Amino acid sequence: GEAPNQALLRILKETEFKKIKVLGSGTVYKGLWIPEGEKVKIPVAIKETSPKANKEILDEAYVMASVDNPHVCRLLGICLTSTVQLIMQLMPFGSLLDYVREHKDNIGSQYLLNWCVQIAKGMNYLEDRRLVHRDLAARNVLVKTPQHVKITDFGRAKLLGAAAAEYHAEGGKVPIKWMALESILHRIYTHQSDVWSYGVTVWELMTFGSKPYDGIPASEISSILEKGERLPQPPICTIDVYMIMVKCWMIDADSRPKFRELIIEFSKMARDPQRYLVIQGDERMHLPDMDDVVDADEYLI
Ligand SMILES: CC(C)n1c2cc(Nc3ccnc(-c4cnn(S(=O)(=O)C5CC5)c4)n3)ncc2c2c(OCC(F)(F)F)cc(N3CCN(C)CC3)cc21
């Protein structure tokens, strides 16, 4: 079959961490984790009740605990109290979707193209691990620092079985406007359907947070795409960047780019960013007790 998953699932004591504030709901807290007698304090986000509810949060914990890459969020541990809590690395600047919205006027081309490279590295890693994310979107990329983003939200993620490289889903609330056409029609998901979502994600970034197909009810989307419509070329995008996006949206899934090629193409563009994104004012912009604080990326096993 396949290789044994020897990731370790760390069980954390409720006494080891302190909730500090609410960051979100739709419920994530900001907080501090102090492993018992280690002289470290680790900034964390804590994400908190039916029996199917905990069935799903544990599936996410399974996936999040099994990944280890600079451009994906890993589970630090879980806490098994009255309710199941995921303990994750604090990503201080929020989701990239909110970040590009709140900072339109000081995001230059170098940041945009580097984010594209980093997300492609994260997704290439997930493909190496035979993982299909199925929910890639700018809301699901977090900002550790403005120069370092990570992919998160594995609530739909699916490890491809030993043999077949395709997942068949059931119904539910699905993110239609980020999905390959073959997924909307036949509930088929592959790494190449993640490439489609990558293209939409890149389009969200190049429009500084626009909503894709804004106003169009999702029931219409499958027919729009069948007619050949796609998202429009964002004003800052040269044809070189827009052609990459459009290639992510081909009907033939095998004709879309591979993540490893998207790393290459956007790397090339990142060495001369003003040739590929045209932003008014680019070369002017700029983006940025705790004695024992250590980032999670420096706290290893
Ligand atoms: C919940 C997410 C998006 N979020 C954080 C997540 C993490 N960490 C992590 C690390 C790994 N995985 C997740 C995770 C799992 N699943 N998901 S998710 O929710 O499904 C999906 C995203 C929709 C997220 N979160 N770290 C800080 C923040 C954070 C934040 O930090 C600010 C500070 F605390 F650093 F100062 C501010 C804000 N906001 C700014 C204020 N406005 C009003 C609301 C949004 C959101 C923030």
- DSSP string spanning 25-56? ---EEEEEE--TTSS-BEEEEEE---HHHHHH
- Side-chain half-sphere exposure of 180, counting CA atoms within 13 A: 26
Is there a domain that residue 297 lies in?
Answer: no
CA of 89 to the centre of ligand 1 (A): 10
Is there a domain that residue 225 lies in?
Answer: yes
Whether 123 and 243 map to the same domain: the answer is: yes
CA of 23 to the centre of ligand 1 (A): 6
Whether 148 and 47 map to the same domain: the answer is: no
Q: Is 262 exposed, middle or buried (0-12, 13-18, 19+ CB in 10 A)?
A: buried
| Closest Cα to atom 41 of ligand 1 | 23
9, amino acid identity: L
Q: Is 79 helix (H, G, I), strand (E, B) or coil?
A: strand
Tell me whether residue 292 is one of the annotated catalytic residues.
no
From 38, 59, 90, give the residue that closes a domain.
90
Residues in the chain: 301
Angle between helices 239-247 and 191-206 (to 10 degrees): 150
Whether 63 and 126 map to the same domain: the answer is: no
- Neighbour tally for 129: CB within 10 Å: 16
Whether 143 and 247 map to the same domain: the answer is: yes
Whether 135 and 73 map to the same domain: the answer is: no
Whether 261 and 148 map to the same domain: the answer is: yes
Is there a domain that residue 293 lies in?
Answer: no
CA of 152 to the centre of ligand 1 (A): 10
Whether 34 and 49 map to the same domain: the answer is: yes
| Closest Cα to atom 5 of ligand 1 | 94
Whether 104 and 154 map to the same domain: the answer is: yes
Is there a domain that residue 163 lies in?
Answer: yes
Whether 46 and 182 map to the same domain: the answer is: no
**Of ligand 1's atoms, which has the minimum distance to the CA of residue 153?**
16
CA of 177 to the centre of ligand 1 (A): 22
The residues that bridge with 188 in the sheet, in sequence order, are 168
Q: Is 21 helix (H, G, I), strand (E, B) or coil?
A: strand
Distances (CA, A) of 292 to 12, 34, 43, 155, 228: 19, 10, 11, 33, 56
Total domain count for the chain? 2
Is there a domain that residue 299 lies in?
Answer: no
**Of ligand 1's atoms, which has the minimum distance to the CA of residue 73?**
11
Q: Name the pairing type of β-strands 75-80 and 84-89.
A: antiparallel
Residue numbers of the domain that contains 84: 1-90
* Short-list 92, 91, 63, CA closest to 78: 63
Is there a domain that residue 295 lies in?
Answer: no
Structure token pair of residue 249: 């949206």
Whether 108 and 84 map to the same domain: the answer is: no
Whether 196 and 278 map to the same domain: the answer is: yes
Q: How was this structure determined?
A: X-ray
Catalytic choice (59, 98, 135, 282): 135
Is there a domain that residue 56 lies in?
Answer: yes
Angle between helices 259-270 and 191-206 (to 10 degrees): 30
Whether 137 and 239 map to the same domain: the answer is: yes
236, amino acid identity: I
149, amino acid identity: V
Which residues have a Cβ under 8 Å from the Cβ of 132 and sit 6 or more positions away? 126, 157, 158, 159, 160, 167, 189, 190, 191, 193, 194
Let me know: does 78 contact 61? Beta carbons within 8 Å: yes
Helix or strand (DSSP H, E) at 168: strand 167-168
Name every protein residue with a CB atom under 6 angstroms from any ligand 1 atom. 23-24, 28, 30, 45, 47, 73, 88-92, 94-95, 98, 139-140, 142, 152-153
From 90, 117, 135, give the residue that closes a domain.
90
From 40, 59, 90, give the residue that closes a domain.
90
| Closest Cα to atom 40 of ligand 1 | 94
Instruction: Give the whole-angstrom CA distance, residue 202 versus residue 56.
Output: 28
